Amino acid sequence: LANELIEFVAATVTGIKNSPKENEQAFIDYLHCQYLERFQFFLGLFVFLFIVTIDIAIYDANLANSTLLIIKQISAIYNAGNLASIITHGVSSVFGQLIKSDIDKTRRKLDDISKQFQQLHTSIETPDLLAMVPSIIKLAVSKGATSHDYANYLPSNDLESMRFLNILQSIANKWFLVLKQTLFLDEVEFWSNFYEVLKSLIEQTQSQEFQVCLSVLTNAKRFHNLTNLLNEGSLSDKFKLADKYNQFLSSIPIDEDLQELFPVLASSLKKFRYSGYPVQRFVVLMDKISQEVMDAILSNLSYGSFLGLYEKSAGMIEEWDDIVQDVNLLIR
Amino acid sequence: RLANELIEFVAATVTGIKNSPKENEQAFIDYLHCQYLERFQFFLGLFVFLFIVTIDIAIYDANLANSTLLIIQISAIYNAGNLASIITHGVSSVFGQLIKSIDKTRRKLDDISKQFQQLHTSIETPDLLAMVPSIIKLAVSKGATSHDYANYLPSNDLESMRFLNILQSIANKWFLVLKQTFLDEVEFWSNFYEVLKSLIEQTQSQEFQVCLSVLTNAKRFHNLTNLLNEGSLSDKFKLADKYNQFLSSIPIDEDLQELFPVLASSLKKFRYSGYPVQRFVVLMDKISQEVMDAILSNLSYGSFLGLYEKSAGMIEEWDDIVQDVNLLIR
C-alpha cells in the first residue's frame, strides 16, 4: 500500500488527472478520489487541499493565503479542532445508532469517548514554555562569577568564531519575538501560563543565561543596536504588564439570589476596573460571560408555593437581564 | 431550520434521482450525492445524514443482515471498529501535524491512543444479558420450587391473558436475537461462551422453567417448540462455545527454539475437528502475517551473517509450516 501511495503522490505531482468541467468543488474532490481510483487502476492515508494541495512545508503559506480531502474509509475537511469535533460527531452518531441495536463495556466506551472530547477541549488551551541554555562555556561562566563581572578568562573573548555567538543570539531573539507574537477559564489559565513563561522570560532576561554576556558582546561590535532585542525586552515588560492586566478576574462561582446579586455587583466592579488594552476580545469575553451567567440562571433553576418561587426567580431573571443591559451600556 | 433543510434534502433524495448515471463507481455515486447536496443548497437558497436516506440531530437491519454519513459545513465520512480506526488514523494525522510546532499536547495525543484502545475494546466486547418476570414470578420462585409443588402462586389463572402472552413473547424475542448474534476474537468467543452460560442459567428452574410449565399447564402456544428446538439450539451453542472455546496456545515475543515450539503449537492447532469455515482461514492468514512480524521483532559481521543464515533456516521452517497449512487447508 505504501508503494502505491508513493506512486499516487508521484502521479499527483507529475500528472494531475485532467479535470472534467463539473464545477462542484465537492464534485472536484470526488473527482480527486476518482483520480486516486485511477491511480489504483494504474497500480493494479493521503491528503490534499484546495490551486490545490497533495500530501500524506508551504502549508503555513497556504494557511496564510478551503477544503481538505483525507482518505483511507474517507474524510472531508470543509487543524485538530475540526478533527476532534468530527470525531465527537461520529461518536454522537454511533451513540444515537446504539439505541438500536447493541454492553456495559460499550457504555464504558461511550463514557471514554466523552472523556476524549473533554481531553480534546483541554488541548485547545495551549502553553509551551522555553528555557534557553545557549553554550557550554556560558554554563562554565554561570558556574563561575556573573557575566556583569569579568568572565575571568585572562582573555574573555575568542575572535575566531563569535559567529556562534551571533547565531545563538539571533535565534534567541527570533524565538523571543515568536513567543511575544504568540502571547475561557481555560483562557485565563493560559494567560497565567503566559505570565509564568514571561517570568521564565524574565529569568531569561537575567545574566546567568549570559544575556549580560550578550549585552557585553553587543558592547562587542556585531549587532550592537540590539534595539529589537532591547525593544523586545520593553515589549516583554509590556506583556508582563498585560498579564498583570489579564491576571485580574472577577470570580464566576459555582452554586442564593442575594449571592447572585453580589456576583453581579462584582461583575459590575469588573466592568468598572481600570482600562487595559481591549480588542473586540474584551467584548467577546463579555458576551461569553453573559452566556455563562445565563448558565448560572440555569444552574439556579436546576405546588403553588413552588410556582410563586418560580415567579420570584423570573423577576430575578428580569433583573439579571436588566444587569446584562447594564453590561451593554458599559460596553458602549 | 437546519433540521428542516436536512429533512427537505432527505425528501428530495427519497424522491430525487441522481439524475445522470455515467461512469458509476462508489466514489462517483458519492460525488453525485455531493451534487444532490448541491441541489439541497439550491433548494434552501450539529446534524448527521446517512445516505438510502436517514438523519440524526428496518432497512438498516436488513442491510446489517445481508454507506456514508455527511455531518453538518460538512464532514462527509464513508461499523464501530471502522469508525474508531478512522478516528485513530485522524489522531495520528493530527499528531503528525505536530512536527509543525507541549507535554500536555503529548498527554492529549496519548489520550487519543487511549481512546482508540478503548474503542477497540468496545468493538470486541458487546454482550447482552437477561430478562425477568419478577413482580409475581420471582416471589413464587422464592416461595416454591420450579415444580407445581405447593404451587405457591395464584391458583386462579386469568389466562395471563396478556401477562402470560407477554411473558412468552418476551422469552421468544430474546431467544431469536441472542442466538443469532484475533485475541479480540478469542475474547469475543469467550464472551459468547459466557452468554451461552447466561442462556443455560436462563434454561434453569431459577429461570421460568416453571413459567413455561404453567404456559404448558394451560394452553401454552406462544413459545413454539422452537422453544424446545431452541433448547436444542442452545445445546448446539454450548457445543459451539466448546468449539468456540479453542486454545491456540501461541504467544508473541532461545528465540529460534521458541519459534520452533510455536510452529509445533501451530501444527497442534492445525489438528482440528471444528473451526470457523472461512473465519478460521482468515485467522490463519492474520496469524501468518503476525508470525512474520514476530520474526521482525526478533530481527527488526561474520556472526551477524551466521545469525542471518540461522534466520534463513528459520524462514525455511516457516515456509514448511506454511506448506503444512496448505495440507490442512486441502
Curated annotation (Swiss-Prot), chain B:
Signal peptide: none annotated. Residues 102-120 form a coiled coil. It comes from the Eukaryota. It is found in: Cytoplasm, Cytoskeleton. Disulfide bonds: none annotated. The dynein complex consists of at least two heavy chains and a number of intermediate and light chains. Interacts with DYN3. Belongs to the dynein heavy chain family. Present with 195 molecules/cell in log phase SD medium. Dynein heavy chains probably consist of an N-terminal stem (which binds cargo and interacts with other dynein components), and the head or motor domain. The motor contains six tandemly-linked AAA domains in the head, which form a ring. A stalk-like structure (formed by two of the coiled coil domains) protrudes between AAA 4 and AAA 5 and terminates in a microtubule-binding site. A seventh domain may also contribute to this ring; it is not clear whether the N-terminus or the C-terminus forms this extra domain. Cytoplasmic dynein acts as a motor for the intracellular retrograde motility of vesicles and organelles along microtubules. Dynein has ATPase activity; the force-producing power stroke is thought to occur on release of ADP. Required to maintain uniform nuclear distribution in hyphae. May play an important role in the proper orientation of the mitotic spindle into the budding daughter cell yeast. Probably required for normal progression of the cell cycle. This is Dynein heavy chain, cytoplasmic.
